[PDB]
Amino acid sequence: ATLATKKATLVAALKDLQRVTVAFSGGIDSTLVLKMALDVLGRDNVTAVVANSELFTDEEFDKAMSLAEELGANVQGTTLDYLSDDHIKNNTPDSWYYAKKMFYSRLNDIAANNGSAAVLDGMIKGARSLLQEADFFKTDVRALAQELGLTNWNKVASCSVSSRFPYGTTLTHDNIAQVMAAEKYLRSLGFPTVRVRFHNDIARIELPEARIGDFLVFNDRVNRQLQSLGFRYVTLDLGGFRSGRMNDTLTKAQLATFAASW
Amino acid sequence: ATLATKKATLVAALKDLQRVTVAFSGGIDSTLVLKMALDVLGRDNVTAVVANSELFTDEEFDKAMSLAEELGANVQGTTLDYLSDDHIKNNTPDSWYYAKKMFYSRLNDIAANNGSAAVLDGMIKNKARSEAGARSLLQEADFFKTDVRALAQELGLTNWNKVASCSVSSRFPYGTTLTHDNIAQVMAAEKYLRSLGFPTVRVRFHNDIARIELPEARIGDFLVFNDRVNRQLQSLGFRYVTLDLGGFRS
Amino acid sequence: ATLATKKATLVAALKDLQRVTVAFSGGIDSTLVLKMALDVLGRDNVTAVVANSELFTDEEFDKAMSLAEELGANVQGTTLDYLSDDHIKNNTPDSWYYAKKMFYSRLNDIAANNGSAAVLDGMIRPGLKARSEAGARSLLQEADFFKTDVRALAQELGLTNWCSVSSRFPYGTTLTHDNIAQVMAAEKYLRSLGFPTVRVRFHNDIARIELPEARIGDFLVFNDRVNRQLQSLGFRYVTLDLGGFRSGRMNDTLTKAQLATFAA
Amino acid sequence: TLATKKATLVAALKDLQRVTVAFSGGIDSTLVLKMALDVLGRDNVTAVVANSELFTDEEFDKAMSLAEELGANVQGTTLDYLSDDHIKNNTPDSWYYAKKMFYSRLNDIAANNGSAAVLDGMIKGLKARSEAGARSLLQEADFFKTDVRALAQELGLTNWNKVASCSVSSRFPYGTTLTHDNIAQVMAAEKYLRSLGFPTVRVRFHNDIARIELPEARIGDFLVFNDRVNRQLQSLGFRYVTLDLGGFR
Amino acid sequence: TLATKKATLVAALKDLQRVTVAFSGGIDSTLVLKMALDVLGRDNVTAVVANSELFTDEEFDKAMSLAEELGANVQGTTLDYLSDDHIKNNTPDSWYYAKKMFYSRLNDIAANNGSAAVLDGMIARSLLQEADFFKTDVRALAQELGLTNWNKVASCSVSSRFPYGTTLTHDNIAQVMAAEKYLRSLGFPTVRVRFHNDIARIELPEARIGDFLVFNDRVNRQLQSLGFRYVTLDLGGFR
Amino acid sequence: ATLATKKATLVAALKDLQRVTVAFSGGIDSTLVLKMALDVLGRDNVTAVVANSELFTDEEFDKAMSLAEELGANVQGTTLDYLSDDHIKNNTPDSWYYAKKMFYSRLNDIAANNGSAAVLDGMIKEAGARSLLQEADFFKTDVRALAQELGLTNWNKVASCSVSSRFPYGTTLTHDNIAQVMAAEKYLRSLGFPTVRVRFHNDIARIELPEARIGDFLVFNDRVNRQLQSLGFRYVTLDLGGFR
Ligand SMILES: [Fe+3]
Ligand SMILES: [Fe+3]
């Protein structure tokens, strides 16, 4: 019902699971659970685990680590070898599941050796997703994180760099470095939400459509900058990032049909 | 002069009333009145009323309802039919006043029926309400915008509706009759434009012409959406979809 | 058929009429009828008439007279008051017919008075066809000309040559001298900013500007000057159509059919 | 002297008496056709305009109308260039086998109308022309582009194709095999882009990726068309529709 | 942790007992001024807002309101920067002589009210910097205190708008400051109007230059009535 | 009266002069006089002069010689030394007079030494030359009409202007500043901007473009900025007012 009741449903499961390990990504979803666990259970009874890996930037790792210390949490860096998994290494469509399976297996073992009763993630509307078990929607997380005074969290969602390569394409340290350096370079010009999709020698840039207007001034520099990172053709996706999201009634449903044809 | 002396006038006035009904919009002023009412009179002696009507979005109503709950108030919405008044429906320059009269009149009936001694609104030192006897206690205690921000800071209020809205009547020329259909279509258009990333927008109604007012510094970004906006607002029932070269409040 | 058979049918028709008044628009077809009238009948047996009215710009009229003088014809301008007809003044969807009816009537008055045996135009609804009602002859249509065959004879004979303001007004809007000037001044200002293909559509206190969409990007630097200029011409609101000049012409398959559906 | 070149050219045509002209609409072939018509008369000159999968109807329709605009008897012919696998496999010598297919059909046309030669607009890799016995009379008379433009002004030609249209195969990487469908896809895409007001456009084919080359100075004008172009080319069968940040070529 | 940082800064204030605070109205001085008020009480804190020609009246009138809003005893003071010959003739050292005039005055105010230190917002005593507050730590503790209102444009000295060697005058400073007030009012918070005698060279971040096209003619006519002959836009942008 | 009348007046005036020297810039006005002169007097009685100087571009000079050749004329280049006059060199509002004096002086001695009866130039509706188009009351409209009638299609469609206009009054021109300005406008023109001015303000470049082209120019900001800096400007800027 009200936010208070959903918050009370949250408190009740925390006090029932005496100790917990928090799977902490830095986003607002995990910021909420990590904060709530601390103030219901205490700094001595909650441990923060921030995964480190080759599929995420050193910046998202560094940022989540500082956010967890500054929430008063005792934080733990943990290091996963996703690219030693042939599904992930070869980016089959089922990569995402084996990568999560490697993930939660690590927290299973880590929670085992710190006395925890469950492993909590931050998923909303055998780990526990109390936000989902308390009927928290997106609107409820923002409100609760507002009333708790939390102000710092990943404003732009982090995503596994697998999303930038086609399926079947094998990921290499050269690949990822190529894609990560190109997205880092774009972000430095003022495009925080950006994807650089990798297509062998074509680099294919997705911007928020609202921003494409402002991007025209950086064409030549982006083109020469990304070429020197090894792309022959630097191109701009005319659909933008999350195409169809802002299309009118008729062209979002058509754009979905094309999205489903692949 | 001190905020302390002004907080005291306001507390004393609430203690004198014992039991109030609050006109709650979600803004900092009505958030400040509602939080002082709850801390002074307790949750059972305070009623938050949120008006729901055709002249404002359901979304904005939903926001005020949840904000009043987040403060720990007993909140009830009341639904007003402003279009029943022929001054409001025919949109004459006095529609503003007959609207407010219908609103304050409804609050008094709620207040009569729950035992409250007054209706409270959020007006500060910066008609129709005075005719109904509503009390503006921030204005009686000489609050300015900065004292509201000061007392909100001291009470730990950090969440209110940063954009107070205005009635959908502002989208229709004087003399234009307001109907349920053209109100909905105007509200849908502005909703669609907000979803594209234009927070400050107006779709002014001119029968078969929609005239879109945007901040001029945002028109450069808008071109990539011309054809989508044009076809979307046509499917909402405007024949021609245009953009005002004068901009927002041209 | 043959172009030879088409010039011959055309030559015979002119020889029969012996003296003609030609309705001269400056278009490729009426340039062809006028120059063929001259070569077959000589300058003394041909009168070119060019119509002037409120519904066309002075620049365009001065052009047609100058195009006809360059052909060596005896050219005459005539001034029509199209707004005298209540179909034209009230801008009904058949107002184009009543315009042509008023013009053919005046040409027929000119032709009677100068001794022409026919009125000629360059052609290839609520009643009789204005031409049949006026006795006008379209000899390129009798000679079965296509745009191609006209195109052959203009270069062949060695020629180089080439909308009513009412289209800026909704059906039913009454047209006045003031508001017609208002539309024409507005479009003239936009053309001077470098926008040759433009429309200023009249919606009482609203001006609605149609541009080719491929130019709307380069128009922004003029937004503010356009808005104050057209407001001083008497519009309260100056707006830009998001569909552009001819909405739906330059869309994809699915959205050009969507825009077509909405117009009905 | 231009008089001496014009005089050699008139003399050559008088001798041939009846000709077939390969007509592109360009300044060079417009001049050959206009000299042929003025020397031999319309009855003795045949204009041929080739239509094929590797060139647009718009270029073909326009050369057909330019040929009538000169007063010529103009005839269209359709070439099936993809019959030759050197053309179909898109090798660097594909233009020779295309050129060879073309002159071969022109010979067949002239045999059947009684012409003594095929004429094209070449002036001072034309091996295919030599193998078929075609004549380039602007080159035989020492015409350069400045003599062509001078005699065109002298004959008062003001209308001809300024755009020298290129074969669609240039939109496919060398070695990528050309099919009827992927040719249509590139032709429909480019036709749609030209119709929006971009005459100089290229859609480079990368299977499921369309890569659009525009002159950079037109990219600002293009912003209003992003969503329509993107959905139009996806409906032509491309998965991704992109714009090259480098511009045209 | 923030609670550890907050402790480091709470204890340091209790040491000093009486403080004088250099108050600019940004989130750093705002966070320092509130903590000082909450740790030492109103009677032991003096907020100084500086008034000069190198900054705007709006920045001065805003900081004075916000410090009172914060519940502090606020005192304006007026520095006369142009009486320094280095400032006036704008030498690449001018920043130093400007800071000498400023902190000298603050020491003069604090010595005369019996404070133990002048405090500022650098992240004089920079207690936020001593407690290792980072930009995120300042945001965290400000929202924790219920603070929502501070000046979100960090002002910059107007001398930067002038070439080295350009004698500042009351007129050219006024001229430049009004030009950026107008541009800021169009929706461009980060802007520089660089002074080149009869030429104005406008610096905008490159991501905003497209959004600016609609204002060219208005900005041109405006800044010319402010005395520039030629109004121009630096193709390089801000910085 | 009629264009056919204006043409005759111009043919009759040409038949009078018999031999003429024609000052040829390569725009539609100049091109039209040279064609009419050639078409009335023939190649042997017409002398096209194209002027080469530091105040105009080599690209425009090579083009005018090409078009005069293309039009069927015996074309003669000549090189003026404008900066050798100190009124021109110090860039005073009197400069136009001394430049026009130096120019027509060279043309008159050319015409005197080839025995023409008059120097002709392209002026339409400064006394050593005859403006036969202006004498026949030709307007820019009459020139286009008679030009297409003759099949003239190729000329300089951007009106060339003397580079001294890019410098403030009183700024002495040098071969270095001129080269600098000329290099800057050559570069901008190569990006797709035929009409541009790069106004010289010592260390500041003020680029003047037609306003309708300023939207299309954003894609070039960084390149123009870097290029014009290697030519010696410290600040490369864009006039908010645009061309003129
Ligand atoms: Fe453009
Ligand atoms: Fe923008």
UniProtKB/Swiss-Prot annotation, chain A:
Disulfide bonds: none annotated. It catalyses: pyridinium-3,5-dicarboxylate mononucleotide + [LarE protein]-L-cysteine + ATP = [LarE protein]-dehydroalanine + pyridinium-3-carboxylate-5-thiocarboxylate mononucleotide + AMP + diphosphate + H(+); [LarE protein]-L-cysteine + pyridinium-3-carboxylate-5-thiocarboxylate mononucleotide + ATP = pyridinium-3,5-bisthiocarboxylate mononucleotide + [LarE protein]-dehydroalanine + AMP + diphosphate + H(+). Pfam families: NAD_synthase. It comes from the Bacteria. The modification 2,3-didehydroalanine (Cys) is found at C159. GO terms for molecular function: ATP binding; lyase activity; sulfurtransferase activity. It is an enzyme of class 4 (lyase). InterPro entries: LarE (IPR005232), NAD/GMP_synthase (IPR022310), Ni-pincer_cofactor_biosynth (IPR052188), Rossmann-like_a/b/a_fold (IPR014729). Keywords: ATP-binding, Lyase, Nickel, Nucleotide-binding. The keyword Transit peptide does not apply. Disruption phenotype: Deletion of this gene leads to a loss of lactate racemase activity. This is Pyridinium-3,5-bisthiocarboxylic acid mononucleotide synthase. It comes from Lactiplantibacillus plantarum (strain ATCC BAA-793 / NCIMB 8826 / WCFS1) (Lactobacillus plantarum). The lineage of its organism: Bacteria, Bacillati, Bacillota, Bacilli, Lactobacillales. The gene is larE.
UniProtKB/Swiss-Prot annotation, chain B:
Its EC number is 4.4.1.37. This is Pyridinium-3,5-bisthiocarboxylic acid mononucleotide synthase. Keywords: ATP-binding, Lyase, Nickel, Nucleotide-binding. Induction: Induced by L-lactate and repressed by D-lactate. Is thus regulated by the L-lactate/D-lactate ratio. Makes part of the lar operon (larABCDE). Disruption phenotype: Deletion of this gene leads to a loss of lactate racemase activity. The keyword tRNA processing does not apply. It catalyses: pyridinium-3,5-dicarboxylate mononucleotide + [LarE protein]-L-cysteine + ATP = [LarE protein]-dehydroalanine + pyridinium-3-carboxylate-5-thiocarboxylate mononucleotide + AMP + diphosphate + H(+); [LarE protein]-L-cysteine + pyridinium-3-carboxylate-5-thiocarboxylate mononucleotide + ATP = pyridinium-3,5-bisthiocarboxylate mononucleotide + [LarE protein]-dehydroalanine + AMP + diphosphate + H(+). Belongs to the LarE family. The gene is larE. It comes from the Bacteria. The active site is at C166 (nucleophile and sulfur donor). The modification 2,3-didehydroalanine (Cys) is found at C166. Gene3D superfamilies: HUPs (3.40.50.620).
Curated annotation (Swiss-Prot), chain C:
The keyword Nucleotide-binding applies. The modification 2,3-didehydroalanine (Cys) is found at C163. Induction: Induced by L-lactate and repressed by D-lactate. Is thus regulated by the L-lactate/D-lactate ratio. Makes part of the lar operon (larABCDE). Its EC number is 4.4.1.37. The active site is at C163 (nucleophile and sulfur donor). It is an enzyme of class 4 (lyase). It catalyses: pyridinium-3,5-dicarboxylate mononucleotide + [LarE protein]-L-cysteine + ATP = [LarE protein]-dehydroalanine + pyridinium-3-carboxylate-5-thiocarboxylate mononucleotide + AMP + diphosphate + H(+); [LarE protein]-L-cysteine + pyridinium-3-carboxylate-5-thiocarboxylate mononucleotide + ATP = pyridinium-3,5-bisthiocarboxylate mononucleotide + [LarE protein]-dehydroalanine + AMP + diphosphate + H(+). Coiled coil: none annotated. Gene3D superfamilies: HUPs (3.40.50.620). It holds the Pfam family NAD_synthase. Disruption phenotype: Deletion of this gene leads to a loss of lactate racemase activity. Keywords: ATP-binding, Lyase, Nickel, Nucleotide-binding. One of its GO terms (molecular function) is sulfurtransferase activity. InterPro entries: LarE (IPR005232), NAD/GMP_synthase (IPR022310), Ni-pincer_cofactor_biosynth (IPR052188), Rossmann-like_a/b/a_fold (IPR014729). Belongs to the LarE family. This is Pyridinium-3,5-bisthiocarboxylic acid mononucleotide synthase.
Curated annotation (Swiss-Prot), chain F:
The modification 2,3-didehydroalanine (Cys) is found at C161. One of its GO terms (molecular function) is lyase activity. Disruption phenotype: Deletion of this gene leads to a loss of lactate racemase activity. It catalyses: pyridinium-3,5-dicarboxylate mononucleotide + [LarE protein]-L-cysteine + ATP = [LarE protein]-dehydroalanine + pyridinium-3-carboxylate-5-thiocarboxylate mononucleotide + AMP + diphosphate + H(+); [LarE protein]-L-cysteine + pyridinium-3-carboxylate-5-thiocarboxylate mononucleotide + ATP = pyridinium-3,5-bisthiocarboxylate mononucleotide + [LarE protein]-dehydroalanine + AMP + diphosphate + H(+). Pfam families: NAD_synthase. Induction: Induced by L-lactate and repressed by D-lactate. Is thus regulated by the L-lactate/D-lactate ratio. Makes part of the lar operon (larABCDE). SUPFAM superfamilies: Adenine nucleotide alpha hydrolases-like (SSF52402). The keyword Transferase does not apply. The active site is at C161 (nucleophile and sulfur donor). Keywords: ATP-binding, Lyase, Nickel, Nucleotide-binding. Its EC number is 4.4.1.37. The keyword Phosphoprotein does not apply. Disulfide bonds: none annotated. NCBIfam families: ATP-dependent sacrificial sulfur transferase LarE. Belongs to the LarE family. This is Pyridinium-3,5-bisthiocarboxylic acid mononucleotide synthase. It comes from Lactiplantibacillus plantarum (strain ATCC BAA-793 / NCIMB 8826 / WCFS1). The gene is larE.
